[PDB]
Design a protein around this ligand. Structure first.
Ligand SMILES: [Mg+2]
Ligand SMILES: [Mg+2]
Ligand SMILES: [Mg+2]
Ligand SMILES: [Mg+2]
Ligand SMILES: [Mg+2]
Ligand SMILES: [Mg+2]
Lengths: 252, 250, 252, 250, 250, 252
């Protein structure tokens, strides 16, 4: 009867999250049982549709981790349907303006605080009769910052009461600033942009998250005071592991 | 051409992946690494027929030979996988000559076996001359994972219509009264594994083995195993995630 | 070769409809074979995606009931794809303005009456060569009224020629008015709002539907002159039935 | 712990749900009611392996022990369900001691049976010490639904590796030449059902029964049945919908 | 009523479609053409149980009798398809009287067979009086596709609980040592096919045959075949696409 | 390592494409192996959802043909998710204005040329390390012209740099102009409209495609200089073939 990421935050500690681009329940449960506070299912840069995300949310919850979704788009009706299927954290792409941040906030909260439609199929099963009283606290909402425009509008995005804060996509931010879309990019202008967003989030009393492609990059981001750190995509970790196993099998 | 059979014909072993996670994306990505084949496990996984079918397509596009470790040595199940573009079969619990003959029966059209004719995907890969070459397009391995199979190894290896045997060493360890540890050092299990390899090669047959690590796979290749699997997608992914979390949390 | 809800209406009788939040064809056919005129598949407050709705529409039609969908969102392209898969009734959420009611109407009718795209895969199989001539009559469209704004705009929503009328969500209307989201809410302000919408729909020569959580509430709504009454969600009926079976099994 | 086995160890019977409708949402909701277990029917339903797999997860999250009534007493099918987190098995058409031995063979690792080792989901629930306790994590019941099974009840009950028997009373009614009515009052069927219960308890074994109603389930619990199912999701939902329509239409 | 059985009772043969492509849309569209039945092939296709279930619904809505050609003559597989609204069964590799008896056992409730009782979809179509008429709602055909089946034709035809036999002429051609060509002119295959038809009609039983073309189907109907399939969705679609491309490219 | 449609165009030859409304991989691979340059999966006038399109794209690529998708809607996030699943051609419906053509272009190209989000799961596997350098060339984008409005705005639609050109839906264009939605319509006003669009596309140095319901109509469109010709829908070809087989089986 608590959001595990929110419990971390209430203790003044960051949350470490997994990141799934591969559909299915077995790896979802296994990774949820490791020392992850949450597991983010990526519905943007993956082949995971609604049909496949639904049982994965169940598997992550059984594993003991908070099920999160990175959506395809900041669409209120998509986000509401994931909340009612037991997604307890939302990362919405391409939040570039206050109005887009208000669109995300609108989907996370029942009236009067937003316009979330009422039919909480799975949250009512998890939280029971006392769900509606605490519904807003059961859900974490992060607006993605991955453009020049979002960078320019960061203080107006952070002024929106109904979002917990922001989630940095460093590779898309690198690409939008005219740099190589490198995994864990340390391009100086992108590093400055990322530090600026982190500073503005904490100045506004808001949370800041970041996508990492490695444990090493995630350690530095945790040391820099990021509230929500993801590492690393199941597909990238599996491909790296398989390459290494093959190299060791084939070695002289 | 069957890429495993090409390895063997060029005097080289095959290195194979091993999938317990359903889905096409990791299947294609691992197929594109330096694997000759990728085995889809339909026994110790939740992969049903519905999920295996597009995975075989994804492995083939990746450039690796799609293999299936079946739930059971059942001829009709094996025939449906062959017609869906499974070009290698590893059948569990082949403990007798008669069970090895049941496996062979499913891999070959009449007169050599009783494979039913309707090759939906092989006829697309191989074209109208598929029948003449059908037996050579498929690799069949009988699993050795019991004391009984170990006792009957010579009679299993006498069946002309299987390429040879595939050692399941965790089940073999368990059936011998030892811990079911992958890549075991247990003296009796190591002796039994070497024995099966020696008997397979003495009978002019191929021998494969399931491995949990690249380091163990290297030794098995050096010992002369024809078909070496390393390592299950789920085991590799869990180990990689544990390590990433340890690096993140210092 | 008739919409069964439209046949009820042409005889001056209301239609009684089922309501499915559980995916699958077996309960869909079984409930379609009961004394329901239609069966609504809920794609908003359920885990039912397009992949799962498609065979359910087939099952409801075989059962003898009119297949309806309550969509996730009033999106024309979503609604058109359901019509071409054999959805013969559409209930669109969050129709708060005339322009939003015009967006719903646009999806239900071929040019010149709307902008429905032509490729009627399943309706052409049901209706045969005479489909295009009667296509608009084969489909029932209802705009959902579940906000203060929709209540304020009810006469402008009802002025849209291409919708059959409106569908009241009483629980969301209760929540949006600052009341408890109760099943079959009788909160006085919500009861007044609901009676107002019914009066305005019938004054405009339009149909009014309502969601019910019970047979008892549905009987009253039919007695009040509602044209389209749903009762009750498969999940709620199944959970209530299971609770009662367990209570009888465990009794002294 | 296996929640049915905990009931039994604390001298209480288990009350179970029964699912013929595929999907996770009703499975979790019913699991969260006062059911000790929820049986997924893979025989008299359209539930295939693809659909059962996430349902077992949903029941476990709900707090109930996930059970499966299989299509057939097939060892390889049963082993794949155990490795997907089925913690109870009800196998149809167990008519002989040999068929009861086939069921037991699938539930236990060597030396006690021939269960293949690769416990994907049980190793996640139970951790690295799963092998030592694997047999106790699983409840196995042989179905009694024929005159033959009734005649062979003592020989079926002599098999040490099954917890006991599960009466399918509609099929038993049909095979005795009576109407296949659930919760039957047919004198001969009631006598046969009481006989099976008496013989199971005399052999120190558990007895279960399929029920169509809460009222019949109450009597079966009062008679000393260890495992009582009431009632199928489809039958409960159809009855509830008929009643709602009758109330709506006056 | 079973629409194939209605044809037969009115002294007419049935013409059937044949589906190797999964999905409901083509299944309903072809069901609405002048086919009496539509066979879903679960052997030489990637159609699993998950995909067959909604296809049976789609064919029934179309107005044609839904049939399944199973992967194997397995009673439990056949019973699950009957309870999902398969109203015709074509079982492969029926080579002996005992195998024909195994098919009959699955199609009939006790006392006539051992069909398990839980008719989910037939009870919705036929209502509470389904048991009394269940056997007549289902058409059962044993496949003849081997020299052995040909040799045992009289003993196969002696089994009262099958409507008759279904010739698989490509497999029969292959097992006789000929090219597995559909609609073959091979003298010995044509003689064997006529022989099976003559023996089926002499025993008061029905005979069906798989055809690759409308022209061959016309001849088989003129020869007195009771159940004629023409032609597989995949073969018809590929031929149609080749022709469209030839017309487009001049 | 080339888009097969783009290779045709670079040789000054048109591409011939298949058209799939039936879900599944087996017919997709079989048709891909015929003398088609591409195979279009229709996600608008079909029951094919994302879950079903994903393995079909794999099957078409294995067959040797370029996998294309006709989307349900011109939605950037939908189009991006198909590109990352190995859709290498996009046909977007209801492009009626320059701004709508700019919305399509925005989804097909990484920054600076558009705003495509970076996570190319399947294109990175096909193209390897040299993908980002050539990413825009790997993808073909066509705006659908199927309304009066699109016809009126054809030169403004064709002025958008980031689209290869346009795709004519002749049946929807017939319907929107107040004519019968006939397969391969030769309604004089529709034939004039279609010739006008073809002339304007080639005057702007842009490509023009067209949907055909027959090989005979496709031959004429190729002879008229259309760059991209589809013929014919799998469902229509299969139903026609089945009718003919039945007629031959039943003939005296
Ligand atoms: Mg609402
Ligand atoms: Mg055959
Ligand atoms: Mg259109
Ligand atoms: Mg084993
Ligand atoms: Mg039974
Ligand atoms: Mg992005």
């Amino acid at each position: 009867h608590h959001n595990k990421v929110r419990t971390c935050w209430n203790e003044g500690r960051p949350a470490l999250a997994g990141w799934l681009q591969l559909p299915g329940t077995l790896h979802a449960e296994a990774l949820a049982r490791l020392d992850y506070d949450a597991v983010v299912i990526d519905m943007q840069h993956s082949p995971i549709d609604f049909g496949q995300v639904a049982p994965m949310l169940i598997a992550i919850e059984l594993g003991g981790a908070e099920p999160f979704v990175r959506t395809q788009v900041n669409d209120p009706s998509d986000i509401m349907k994931l909340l009612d299927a037991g997604a307890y954290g939302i990362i919405a792409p391409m939040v570039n303006t206050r109005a887009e941040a208000q669109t995300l906030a609108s989907a996370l909260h029942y009236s009067p605080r937003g316009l979330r439609s009422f039919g909480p199929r799975r949250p009512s099963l998890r939280y029971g009769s006392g769900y509606l009283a605490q519904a807003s606290e059961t859900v974490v909402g992060l607006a993605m910052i991955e453009t020049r425009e979002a960078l320019a509008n960061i203080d107006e995005i952070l002024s929106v009461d109904g979002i917990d804060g922001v989630f940095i996509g460093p590779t898309d931010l690198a690409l939008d600033l005219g740099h190589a879309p490198l995994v864990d990019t340390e391009e100086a202008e992108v590093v400055s942009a990322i530090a600026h967003v982190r500073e503005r989030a904490h100045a506004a009393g808001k949370r800041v998250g970041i996508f990492c492609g490695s444990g090493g990059f995630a350690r530095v981001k945790l040391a820099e005071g990021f509230d929500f750190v993801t590492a690393a995509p199941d597909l990238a970790m599996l491909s790296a592991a398989a390459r290494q196993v093959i190299a060791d099998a084939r070695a002289l």
